Amino acid sequence: QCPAPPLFPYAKPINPTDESTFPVGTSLKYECRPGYIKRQFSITCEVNSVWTSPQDVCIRKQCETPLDPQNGIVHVNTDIRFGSSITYTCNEGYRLIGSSSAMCIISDQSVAWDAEAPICESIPCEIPPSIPNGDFFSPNREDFHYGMVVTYQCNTDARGKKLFNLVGEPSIHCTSIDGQVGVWSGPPPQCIELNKCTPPHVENAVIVSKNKSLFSLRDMVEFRCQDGFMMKGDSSVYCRSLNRWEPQLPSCAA
């Protein structure tokens, strides 16, 4: 009263023969297919004319233990057996080279990852910017990677004495915004002559006096707060030594 056995995706019959009718109590010899741990078993035709195979008879074969790449991680979403997949990511300051994923597939008479694990390499940087009248200090002057810091310094005169004022942040570091290209954290500083002041900025104010690309000692700057802003400090300031202003730069508060 049993029909022909089911067509199992995980198993095949050891000795298939031409037939389509089996009485209850009939046992047939089956085998696990490629990608499953080798096992020979029996399927039985039960009293209700339905075929029953033993529970968890065919176990999917395991692929090699994945490792986390150095400076990266391996992500096991299900397991490390036949048909499953793994993905890889690199850590902050590193970029992936190779395959970001692998699948556990049939390889010859066993199973294997259809891709090799990737490399997570340090994000490189271009040489930091050149600045007129100064330079940066580095043990390696032409090799930069994520995290590295460079400090700039102004050139001295022919007698080794201070000749310029270093204006702005003296240090910058190799970073990345996209996790692929290395960028310097900010702009390099400027090396300004000792009798000069760089153009002053006061938020929510305009200069009403003559603007200059660069000011000289005792040059005056007059500021005006924008509409609806209140002034704190004197509106007229003069260029001092060390890129300073006397009185100090004013402020505009809403």
Numbering used by the authors: 37 to 290
Copied sentences from the primary study:
The structure of rat CrrY domains 1–4 has been determined in two distinct crystal forms and reveals a 70° bend between domains 3 and 4. In both crystal forms rat CrrY1–4 retains the same overall conformation and secondary-structure elements, which can be taken to be representative of its solution structure. Small changes at the CCP1–CCP2 and CCP3–CCP4 interdomain junctions induced by the different crystal environments in the two crystal forms cause the two models to superpose with an overall r.m.s.d. on Cα atoms of 1.3 Å over 239 residues. The structural agreement within the individual CCP modules is closer, with r.m.s.d.s on Cα atoms of 0.53, 0.12, 0.29 and 0.60 Å for CCP1, CCP2, CCP3 and CCP4, respectively, over the ∼60 residues of each CCP domain between the two crystal forms. The rat CrrY1–4 CCP3–CCP4 interdomain interface, where the hockey-stick handle meets the blade, buries ∼300 Å2 and is centred on specific contacts between hydrophobic patches on CCP3 (residues 162–167) and CCP4 (residues 228–234 and 278–279), forming a kink in the structure. The overall arrangement of CrrY1–4 is very similar to those observed in the crystal structures of other two factor I (fI) cofactors, fH1–4 and CD461–4. The fH1–4 cofactor, as seen in the crystal structure of the C3b–fH1–4 complex, overlays with CrrY1–4 particularly well in the first three domains, which are predicted to form the bulk of the contacts with fI (28% sequence identity, r.m.s.d. on Cα atoms of 1.6 Å over 180 residues). Thus, a kink at the interface between domains CCP3 and CCP4 in CrrY1–4, fH1–4 and CD461–4 is likely to be a shared feature of all fI cofactors. The major differences between the free (CrrY1–4, CD461–4) and C3b-bound (fH1–4) regulators localize at the CCP1–CCP2 and CCP3–CCP4 interfaces, which appear to be remodelled in forming the regulatory complex, bringing domains CCP1 and CCP4 closer to C3b. The change in orientation of CCP4 with respect to CCP2 and CCP3 is particularly striking when comparing the bound and unbound regulators, with CCP4 rotated more than 70° away from C3b in both the unbound structures (overlaid ) compared with the bound fH.
